[PDB]
Amino acid sequence: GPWVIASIAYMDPGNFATNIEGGARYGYSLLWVILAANLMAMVIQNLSANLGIASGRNLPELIRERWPRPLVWFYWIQAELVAMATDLAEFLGAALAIQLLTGLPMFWGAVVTGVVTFWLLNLQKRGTRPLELAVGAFVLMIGVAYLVQVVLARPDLAAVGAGFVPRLQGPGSAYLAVGIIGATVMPHVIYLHSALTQGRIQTDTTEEKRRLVRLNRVDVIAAMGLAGLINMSMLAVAAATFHGKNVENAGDLTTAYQTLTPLLGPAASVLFAVALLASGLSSSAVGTMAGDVIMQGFMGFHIPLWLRRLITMLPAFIVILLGMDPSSVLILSQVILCFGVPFALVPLLLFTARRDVMGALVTRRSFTVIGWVIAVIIIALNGYLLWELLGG
Ligand SMILES: CCCCCCCC/C=C/CCCCCCCC(=O)OC[C@H](O)CO
Ligand SMILES: CCCCCCCC/C=C\CCCCCCCC(=O)OC[C@H](O)CO
Ligand SMILES: CCCCCCCC/C=C\CCCCCCCC(=O)OC[C@H](O)CO
Ligand SMILES: CCCCCCCC/C=C\CCCCCCCC(=O)OC[C@H](O)CO
Ligand SMILES: CCCCCCCC/C=C\CCCCCCCC(=O)OC[C@H](O)CO
Ligand SMILES: CCCCCCCC/C=C\CCCCCCCC(=O)OC[C@H](O)CO
Ligand SMILES: CCCCCCCC/C=C\CCCCCCCC(=O)OC[C@H](O)CO
Ligand SMILES: CCCCCCCC/C=C\CCCCCCCC(=O)OC[C@H](O)CO
Ligand SMILES: [Cl-]
Ligand SMILES: [Mn+2]
Ligand SMILES: [Mn+2]
């Protein structure tokens, strides 16, 4: 199973930005958002995985083959904007880590990131599998560090428990809450996960399809459960480190290493930036591969990979030339990603409730309703954010 490197999206630089900023600025009051977004992601990623197993096709393929041509065109275009926002936080997050490790300007950090992403693009599994394992080592261990630091930091349990009750903290809190949902419920994974499980069967029977669904549901929840524990711990450690005090540039990724200083000591700066670098490079490489697959499913053709790697790279250089804050752009991209979630959910909820698509593996009616409740929740939360951002 070499497809495990796609699991870095739940630990991409977007999660680092939203977790650290959420704790530093709003303390523990956003823990419930991470728990909600992680539970929503378990349901959605199971439906996506069950769609590929039951139907044998990925979600963009089904839209292309079943829905009218103009609707398929609109769905491919909005899927490309999702890939732009997704790759932006991951590519810029890698460039930021280059600056944290070498002091190199953000422009040259992106130049280095570009050459590296172009090099990984045309590599086979022989030279990539050791890199995938090395990335998984840094990110897992930096996640274990937060799981250990969240206990050693002695957090205020009264504020931690209160943080699991849904509450907003002004206008900027809904903005960051929407960003936390997009950082966990990622639209590009909704399309991609259906493609990772398609064509993965051996005897093409119902009993075998039910077997792959059972194994997937246990594997998804086990990994998603660990990712949620890490994300909550990272926000809790960030809250216990910065919130309530007045630390300069609190929440920014250039100072986030201080969250692990009591545990790692003088090594907290390098190990954080190394984990952020491996996270950004692998997610940006997987994201480029995923966008090529999503376009092929929607349109029947695709642009060459070097051209896609080039187009998705321009906004990162534009943002750097604009002098914008990298951590603030990482959050904004996650916010934009959450506005693409309802578009991905509607065909997922419809297709997995169809017998001519799923066969005997039609989704249970209870989980179809929970999915539509999740979709309505995210549509309502995206609308309230757009309401305050436009005024009133
Ligand atoms: C991140 C969330 C994004 C939310 C906003 C979504 C993207 C907005 C722009 C859409 C392009 C216009 C959509 C229409 C697609 C082209 C016009 C069309 O209808 O297709 C042409 C023809 O009918 C088929 O062959
Ligand atoms: C087992 C390996 C252990 C390696 C542990 C160290 C890792 C250093 C990270 C990148 C190398 C580039 C660092 C050189 C860049 C010079 C600019 C700079 O980082 O300045 C900071 C300091 O004042 C002067 O290094
Ligand atoms: C394709 C691989 C990249 C090729 C590089 C391989 C190694 C050369 C390293 C440094 C020199 C790079 C050129 C440095 C010249 C910069 C002059 C300048 O004006 O800097 C402005 C800055 O680029 C904002 O526009
Ligand atoms: C403190 C709990 C409230 C925080 C709310 C955020 C959610 C965090 C989720 C799981 C905690 C991680 C626990 C992982 C256990 C590893 C830590 C540990 O074992 O602590 C050893 C230490 O030496 C003993 O003194
Ligand atoms: C089961 C999975 C294990 C994973 C580990 C998850 C860590 C969660 C630990 C603490 C969260 C909330 C505990 C706080 C209990 C309620 C808050 C409190 O301390 O009481 C204050 C009172 O409610 C106000 O007046
Ligand atoms: C803004 C819209 C995107 C801009 C449009 C592209 C801009 C040109 C960029 C690089 C040169 C093309 C990449 C060079 C690789 C050529 C690939 C190719 O055709 O292969 C021929 C030959 O084998 C090669 O070695
Ligand atoms: C077919 C045509 C393509 C369809 C296009 C659909 C529109 C793009 C959708 C979401 C992007 C939202 C981006 C919001 C930009 C906010 C920028 C910002 O807030 O930053 C301040 C500004 O950059 C000062 O530097
Ligand atoms: C706050 C809202 C979130 C609530 C969180 C509740 C926890 C549910 C999470 C995972 C269970 C599995 C989800 C759906 C798994 C597939 C269900 C199904 O019907 O699949 C049967 C068929 O065999 C295959 O196609
Ligand atoms: Cl708090
Ligand atoms: Mn993510
Ligand atoms: Mn900054």
Author numbering: 45 to 436
From the paper:
Transporters of the Nramp (Natural resistance-associated macrophage protein) family import divalent transition metal ions into cells of most organisms. In addition to the physiological substrates Fe2+ and Mn2+, Nramps can also transport toxic metals like Cd2+ and Hg2+ but exclude the abundant alkaline earth metals like Mg2+ and Ca2+. Recent bacterial Nramp structures reveal a LeuT fold, three stable conformations (outward-open, occluded, and inward-open), and identify the metal-binding site residues, including conserved aspartate, asparagine, and methionine residues. We present high-resolution structures of DraNramp in three conformations in both Mn2+-bound and metal-free states, providing the first molecular map of the entire Mn2+ transport cycle.
We obtained a structure of wildtype (WT) DraNramp in an occluded state bound to Mn2+ at 2.38 Å by soaking crystals with Mn2+ (WT•Mn2+). We resolved a comparable structure using co-crystallization with Mn2+ and the inward-locking mutation A47W. The similarity of both structures, including a nearly identical Mn2+-coordination sphere, suggests that the observations we make based on these two structures are robust. Although the inner vestibule is occluded in both structures, WT•Mn2+ and A47W•Mn2+ differ in their TM1a position, with WT•Mn2+ nearly identical to G45R whereas the A47W•Mn2+ TM1a is displaced within the inner vestibule, likely to accommodate the bulky tryptophan sidechain. The conformation-locking mutants—A47W, which is outward-closed and crystallized in an occluded state, and outward-open G223W —also show different behavior with Mn2+ and Cd2+. ITC with Mn2+ agrees with the structural data, with two-site fit for A47W, and one-site fit for A47W-D296A, A47W-D369A, and G223W (assigned to the orthosteric site). However, with Cd2+, the ITC data for A47W fit best with a one-site model and we observed no binding with A47W-D296A, A47W-D369A, and G223W, indicating that there is no significant affinity for Cd2+ at the orthosteric site of A47W and G223W. (C–D) Double mutants of A47W with either D296A (C) or D369A (D) retain Mn2+ binding but not Cd2+ binding, indicating that Cd2+ binds only at the external site and not the orthosteric site of the A47W construct, whereas Mn2+ binds at both binding sites.
